[PDB]
Write a protein that binds this ligand. Structure first.
Ligand SMILES: [Zn+2]
Ligand SMILES: [Zn+2]
Length: 1102
């Protein structure tokens, strides 16, 4: 409902269609003239136009055929997982089965094989054991009819059944063949021969013990080994491989990797059949973590009494675990150890004879590789934090400590050296062992440094997450709740565990007094038995579409990348949720853009209203040029290796068919809303289940809270974006074209705002040179320096009036985009564009809120982040609750997690979090300190206002003298000027000089200025400054100040002399304000476009 036009948007003819028609899910006016047909298919047919809309009809029919068949020759309706797998099965696709514990993969395999046998297509079912084969064939024979032809083979075979199998295999008289992995290994040739239209593998790792079996599988679905070798030759080289454009493969469906999918051969499945076979990962965790202040066995016995059945104790050493077992053996609890009688105690605990099992870390970790039954374990008890300890003596040298400390201290060399080498190097320069330890204390932050026993303790957070994760999984539908209890007295180790757990899993560990045990147990058991009612059908498939690959990686990092479909142009990850399956993919940028072909530079004019015409975007991966026109080579470097976006759209359409509900998670500004509307509009004639998300963080919390306020696409944001872009295209092209006649170059003016800023910078030079006054600086005895007007020579300052007061200095509000860009690019020696890239890299990596904001407002959650950090840091006295603003489009720039820069450094150097450079950490530090200083207590200060007399002139100075009560003073430092007595102060030196009273522009002051003047947006600032820079209108001198170039001065002079009315501030501000009003739906859209046109209509005449 924006009345625009998209170029590859017709679903039937594959051509161009309008906004209003794809919104109504219709083909173009050419394919179907009338507005309301009773049925698109038969209408397209009745007008000899039906073309690619056939595929969708055929799809839905031959899907619900599968559905009705499954419902008939089996129980009832499909579950979500089966619904998705079915929708992928009719399109002949291959994929691993992303699902949790026993959802009926074998059932789906049998049913699909049977349904395919109903056509003439032949399938093959592969199983890990030679016993499950028999069970499968049994459950199959009675399930089939007279029609189907099923067989099989194993080790304990019959007499004539063997030769029955061989003979029926010799001349293709089958539809279904059910054999073991043993058969795939042994009879490799026979399988390499045939071509199956369906290959089902129940156990992936059972077959992955031999590359021969991978190659055999690929040669089973119908791939020649020559292609296979020519792909192996590519993946071994490093890069990824594209397959033949029109090659028909068979269907391969497998389970998940029970273990580690090691090797490089598996990658073939990603390049030949377009699916990844990763290990099944589940971040689906519903757990309450509770900590108990000490290892008191009374508390242990009480808890054991409350939990009763399903308890698991983890000890650190085998000795204290032994002692613990000894203690618990006296209290008639049914406890079993794992260090002597293992299999008996495990297979007892597996059934229910034993109620409490005690294991050591490594023991259980390695010996559980067999089974690991989750339905029994409900409570996990830790007798001490699962940690990793290192020696802090000179010898017994840990390499990373030595590396860090030496790199900071004296003999820093390269990036890495041998262990004993660093040992011998630090055996020299260090002061003492004690000084070494102190250096480790100062340097290392985020770990525990026992300088008493010389021990470096680092909480094994991964171990803790697996072990804790034993108490909560997806069982028969419901994410059953669990309880993890830690007995840790060392407060530091607890703090470390808390921040690491909060970082990686976003999970709070609560204290004992805040935990109501009976309630927790009730929860646990209630959900547990609730997972037995067998409704097991809330399963849905979800699709989240984002425009940046980075958001996708950091989405996989908390949703859990299981498999990855190489879908055409894009890559789509799937994961397991509590409510089914989730699919998330990246767009890798914009999709459409204003074509430059027709009308007014692209915007056509029909029916008295303007209509933007969009076309798919193409980026050259070789040079970098972006273009709209549909061509074979790059219109700059003539390369065929171009990345198209219409491909991305086709992929998104097929994916759209395969899912249940679609959410579009583009960023929460106008730009994101446009990419959103392009996508939804293009997808709408495919599925009616599309909505918008607006994530303000990339975290589980951001995801959830954004899904809470899920809505449909807001059109005023779209209209605003379109008006903006149309202005930039119009004034841009026009002025650029006027300058093409005076300077020769064809790519100059990029808009009005850019030329306004150039106006400021260029006009600045003369007023900077102008207002250069002469000053003198005098430093006083028992006083600071003092800058006053020049030529004074009585050599004495006389205090006239004196007054002192006590005042509470509030802190500065949190960084908005302007504040952030300005003060960060000022403090660090960085340009605004690099700072913007950093902020974006921090937001998309889930470390801060939205970096594009014009509001200092902060949520109660953010305040609570401030409080949890102040509480952790030991200074929660100075916490304050300032929300700063009521009016806020978004929220200010704050961190999402109460973790400082140093702690993050530790996490990086260690290996928890990844992909952050020193600059990222510095910027994050700045945002952190700013935000905390915001939410910290006002500093109580004693300040004075001295009226001094110099050369008969009365000058007033005003200085903060005493900090009588601390506050945000610990984050953003505050200085004190020495006290001024009411006497005469002699002048020590009268330094006569001069500085210019109107300073030039830096990049920071440019952003600050166009913020003050209302000339720009949080998304335009750094784009503007960098536009001026890279297009050679501005240079940065020795003091990193912004000065105009000769080119710039000439250009702006031409602009001012010919077109001043169209470029000066007040017009840019008026249009900015007007467009803002358009965004809120206060100002008409077509009317403001009309305004822009009418004012461009006169620029064409000048
Ligand atoms: Zn059409
Ligand atoms: Zn190119």
């Amino acid at each position: 409902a924006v009345n625009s036009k998209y170029h590859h948007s017709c679903i039937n003819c594959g051509g161009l269609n309008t906004d209003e028609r794809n919104e109504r899910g219709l083909p173009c006016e050419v394919c179907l003239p009338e507005d309301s047909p009773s049925d698109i298919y038969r209408a397209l047919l009745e007008r000899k136009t039906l073309k690619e809309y056939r595929f969708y009809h055929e799809f839905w029919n031959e899907y619900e055929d599968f559905r009705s068949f499954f419902k008939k020759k089996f129980g009832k309706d499909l579950t979500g997982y089966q619904r998705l797998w079915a929708k992928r099965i009719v399109q002949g696709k291959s994929f691993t089965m992303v699902a949790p514990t026993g959802v009926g993969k074998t059932t789906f395999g049998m049913m699909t094989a049977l349904w395919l046998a109903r056509k003439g297509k032949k399938s093959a079912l592969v199983f890990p054991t030679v016993t499950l084969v028999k069970q499968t064939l049994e459950r199959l024979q009675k399930l089939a009819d007279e029609k189907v032809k099923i067989f099989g083979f194993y080790s304990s075979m019959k007499k004539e059944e063997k030769e029955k199998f061989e003979k029926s295999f010799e001349e293709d008289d089958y539809h279904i063949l059910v054999f073991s992995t043993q058969f795939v290994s042994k009879n490799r040739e026979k399988l390499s021969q045939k071509r199956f239209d369906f290959v089902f593998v129940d156990d992936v790792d059972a077959v992955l013990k031999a590359s021969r079996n991978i190659d055999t599988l690929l040669m089973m679905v119908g791939i020649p080994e020559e292609i296979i070798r020519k792909a192996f030759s590519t993946i071994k080289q490093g890069k990824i491989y594209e397959r033949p454009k029109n090659l028909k493969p068979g269907i391969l469906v497998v389970s998940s990797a029970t273990a580690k999918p090691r090797g490089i051969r598996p990658l073939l499945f990603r390049d030949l059949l377009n699916f990844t076979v990763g290990r099944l990962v589940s971040v689906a965790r519903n757990i309450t973590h509770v900590r108990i202040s000490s290892r008191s066995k009374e508390k242990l016995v009480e808890l054991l009494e409350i939990f009763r059945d399903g308890i698991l104790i983890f000890a650190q050493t085998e000795e204290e675990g032994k002692e613990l077992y000894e203690y618990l053996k006296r209290f008639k609890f049914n406890v079993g150890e794992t260090w002597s009688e293992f299999e008996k105690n495990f297979e007892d605990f597996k059934v229910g004879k034993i109620n409490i099992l005690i294991g050591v870390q490594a023991y259980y970790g390695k010996l559980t590789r067999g089974v690991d039954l989750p339905e029994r374990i409900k409570y996990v008890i830790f007798w001490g934090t699962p940690s990793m300890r290192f020696s802090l003596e000179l010898d017994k040298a840990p390499r990373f400590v030595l590396a860090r400390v030496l790199k900071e201290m004296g003999l820093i060399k390269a990036q890495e050296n041998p262990d004993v080498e660093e040992l011998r190097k630090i055996a020299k320069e260090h002061l003492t062992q004690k000084e070494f330890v102190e250096k480790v204390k100062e340097m290392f932050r985020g770990v525990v440094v026992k300088d008493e026993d010389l021990e470096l303790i680092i909480p094994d957070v991964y171990t803790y997450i697996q072990a804790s994760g034993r108490s909560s999984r997806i069982l028969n539908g419901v994410l059953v709740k669990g309880v993890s209890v830690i007995f840790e007295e060392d407060e530091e180790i607890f703090e470390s565990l808390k921040t690491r757990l909060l970082l990686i899993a976003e999970e709070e560990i609560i204290e004992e007094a805040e935990a109501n045990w009976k309630e927790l147990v009730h929860e646990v058991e209630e959900s547990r038995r609730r997972s037995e009612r067998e409704l097991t059908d809330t399963s849905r498939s979800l699709l989240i579409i984002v425009e940046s690959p980075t958001k996708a990686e950091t989405l996989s990092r908390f949703l859990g990348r299981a498999s990855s479909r190489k879908e055409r142009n894009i890559i789509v990850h799937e994961a397991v949720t509590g409510e089914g399956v989730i699919l998330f993919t990246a767009t890798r940028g914009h999709v459409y853009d204003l074509v430059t072909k027709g009308g007014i530079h692209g915007v056509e004019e029909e029916n008295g209203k303007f209509v933007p015409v969009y076309n798919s975007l193409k980026r050259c991966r070789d040079c970098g040029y972006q273009f709209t026109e549909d061509r074979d080579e790059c219109p700059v470097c003539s390369s065929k290796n171009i990345d198209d976006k219409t491909e991305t759209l086709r992929a998104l359409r097929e994916i759209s068919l395969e899912a249940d509900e679609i959410l579009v998670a583009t960023d929460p500004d106008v730009e994101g809303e446009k990419i959103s509307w392009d996508v939804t509009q293009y997808l709408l004639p495919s599925t009616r289940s599309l909505r918008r998300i607006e994530m303000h963080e990339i975290t589980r919390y951001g995801f959830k809270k954004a899904r809470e306020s899920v809505r449909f696409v807001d059109f005023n944001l779209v209209k605003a974006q379109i008006v903006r872009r149309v202005q930039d295209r119009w004034i841009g092209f026009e002025l650029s074209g006027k300058l093409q006649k005076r300077f020769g170059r064809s790519n100059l003016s990029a808009g009005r705002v850019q030329s306004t800023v150039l106006g400021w910078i260029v006009e600045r030079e003369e007023e900077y040179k102008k207002s250069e006054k002469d000053f003198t600086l005098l430093v006083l005895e028992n006083g600071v320096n003092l800058e006053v007007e020049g030529k004074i020579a009585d050599d004495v300052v006389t205090v006239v009036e004196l007054q002192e007061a006590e005042e509470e200095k509030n802190p500065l509000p949190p960084y908005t985009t302007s504040s952030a860009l300005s003060e960060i690019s000022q403090k660090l020696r960085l340009g605004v564009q690099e700072v913007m890239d950093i902020l974006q890299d921090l937001f998309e990596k889930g470390f801060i809120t939205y970096h594009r904001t014009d509001s200092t407002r902060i949520s109660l959650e953010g305040q609570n982040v401030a409080r949890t950090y102040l509480r952790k840091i030991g200074k929660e006295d100075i916490f304050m609750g300032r929300s700063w603003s009521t009016e806020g489009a978004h929220e200010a720039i704050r961190p999402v997690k109460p973790i400082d820069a140093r702690e993050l450094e530790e996490m990086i150097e260690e290996g928890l979090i990844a992909d952050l450079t020193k600059k990222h950490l510095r910027v994050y530090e700045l945002i952190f300190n700013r935000f905390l200083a915001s939410q910290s207590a006002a500093v109580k200060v004693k300040k004075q206002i001295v009226t001094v007399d110099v050369d008969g002139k009365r000058m007033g100075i005003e200085q903060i003298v005493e900090i009588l009560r601390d506050g945000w003073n610990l984050f953003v430092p505050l200085t004190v000027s020495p006290r001024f007595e009411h006497r005469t102060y002699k002048i020590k030196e009268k330094k006569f000089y001069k500085k210019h009273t109107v300073p030039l522009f830096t990049q920071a002051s440019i952003v600050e200025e166009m913020k003050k003047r209302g000339i720009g947006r949080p998304s335009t600032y750094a784009k503007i400054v960098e536009v001026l820079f890279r297009r050679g209108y501005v240079y940065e001198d020795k003091y990193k100040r912004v000065r105009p170039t000769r080119f710039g001065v000439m250009v702006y002079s031409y602009l001012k002399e010919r077109y001043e009315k169209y470029v000066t501030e007040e017009t840019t501000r008026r249009l900015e304000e007007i467009m803002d009003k358009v965004e809120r739906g206060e100002e008409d859209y077509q009317a403001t476009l009309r305004l822009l046109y009418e004012e461009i209509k006169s620029l064409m005449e000048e």
